[PDB]
């Protein structure tokens, strides 16, 4: 007879953007999460003497902005990355108070990330001379009158398929930009057109490839490529 209210279900709606990462990175960036609103649905009603539940009304409380409270839990680029042919995107669950959330359709709410090997211009999970050539070739094309980042594709990958405006070409640019003059101030969210992909990027990459191919650096390239990148870019 006594009427009460209780949460019936709870879901989040999230506005997020893509994020690009290297396989060696230890942290996803929560800046991908632009806005997250938590909805809580209530039922109000009673249980009759016959033990049957009666619902008198259904409603939500005021939705709550929880954008700032969302984390990616324990997931990291390094522990998520798997080399798979023609496949670079991952759905990373968000966490709120150390638990996943459901989206409006009952599925765990996730954010899209792309993770690859630095230097891997052609997106084949291998860093080699072909990547250096592709990077050089893109520089030469975009250095020609009448051509730029908008009309030239960088990656030979079928995922780009010659399409200058593919998101995978932005991802390829991120992977190829091994020499960034601006440093950390040019963020991972820069688009291909916002980067400088030049012969210096191409010659690093080639040198990474050559050093990886001799006894001295074979293991460094395979185990901690980041230490080899620093050597080849003059940063260490």
């Amino acid at each position: 007879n006594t009427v009460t209210s209780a949460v019936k279900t709870q879901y989040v709606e999230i506005e997020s953007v893509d994020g690009f990462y290297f396989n060696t990175e230890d942290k996803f960036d929560t800046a991908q999460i632009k806005k997250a609103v938590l909805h809580t649905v209530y039922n109000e009603g009673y249980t009759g003497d016959d033990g049957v539940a009666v619902v008198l009304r259904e409603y939500e409380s005021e939705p709550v902005d929880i954008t700032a409270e969302l984390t990616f839990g324990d997931a990291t680029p390094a522990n998520t990355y798997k080399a798979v042919e023609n496949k670079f995107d991952y759905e990373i669950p968000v966490y709120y108070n150390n638990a996943t959330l459901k989206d409006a359709e009952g599925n765990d709410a996730t954010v899209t990330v792309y993770i690859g090997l630095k230097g891997d211009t052609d997106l084949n999970n291998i860093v080699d001379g072909r990547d250096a050539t592709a990077t050089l070739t893109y520089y030469a094309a975009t250095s020609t009158d009448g051509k730029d980042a908008t009309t030239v594709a960088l990656s030979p990958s079928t995922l780009v398929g010659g399409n200058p405006e593919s998101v995978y070409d932005d991802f390829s640019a991120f992977l190829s930009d091994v020499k960034v003059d601006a440093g950390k101030e040019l963020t991972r969210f820069a688009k291909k057109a916002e980067r400088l992909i030049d012969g210096r990027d191409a010659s690093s990459i080639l040198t990474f490839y050559t050093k990886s191919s001799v006894d001295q650096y074979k293991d460094m390239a395979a185990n901690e490529p980041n230490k080899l990148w620093d050597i080849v870019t003059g940063d260490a």
């Binding site: 001379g129 050559t210 050093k211 191919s213 001799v214 006894d215």
Partner: protein, 207 residues
């Protein structure tokens, strides 16, 4: 029945195992020749520095991206360039603005890149190798071009777009364009040196 090994060289070349493995139908069939220097006497050879050329033919305007391993008899002494590199690019790579020699013990890894198929025929690389003072008549110091591969990366000889024909050319290069245990030299000096997987040499005529 007995197993024979070279005096001071190992066979690091691996089986070319990328698809396609058979380069017989390749429109472009590149072949790499390596210097075969022969001295008449030990005195003629002892302490001499020899220019060893690695020369490609049959691939003019048909390649862009290369990378292969060179090794030499450990008794030879490499004479580095002014930059410390063990190898120096040649005229075949003049139109390839990416070119890099990486030192590797008794050997070097040599690679190139180009923004189009600007690879040319001719000398790709030179290495200067000095004959030891204690060289004797009959001695052979083999010089090897080898294909290597691992799951992280492998050696290359392909065109700018790494096309189907580029990959056929690559298979041809490594399986027929160079010597290896699967395509052995029949050169008498290399047979004598027990190094028929090798490609060139500095040899001293028998007494």
């Amino acid at each position: 029945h007995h197993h024979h090994h070279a005096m001071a060289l190992t066979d690091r070349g691996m089986t070319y195992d990328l698809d396609p493995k058979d380069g017989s139908s390749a429109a472009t069939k590149p072949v790499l020749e390596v210097t075969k220097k022969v001295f008449d006497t030990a005195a003629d050879a002892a302490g001499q520095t020899v220019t060893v050329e690695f020369k490609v033919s049959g691939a003019e305007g048909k390649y862009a991206t290369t990378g292969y391993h060179i090794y030499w008899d450990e008794r030879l002494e490499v004479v580095a360039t002014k930059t410390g590199a063990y190898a120096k690019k040649g005229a075949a790579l003049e139109d390839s603005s990416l070119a890099k020699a990486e030192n590797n013990g008794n050997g070097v890894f040599v690679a190139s890149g180009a923004d189009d198929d600007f690879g040319a025929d001719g000398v790709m690389w030179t290495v200067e190798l000095k004959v030891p003072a204690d060289a004797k008549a009959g001695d052979v110091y083999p010089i090897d071009v080898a294909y290597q591969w691992d799951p992280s990366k492998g050696d290359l000889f392909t065109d700018n777009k790494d096309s189907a024909q580029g990959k056929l050319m690559q298979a041809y290069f490594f399986t027929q364009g160079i010597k290896s245990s699967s395509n052995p030299s029949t050169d008498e000096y290399l047979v004598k040196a027990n190094a028929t997987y090798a490609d060139g040499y500095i040899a001293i005529k028998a007494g």
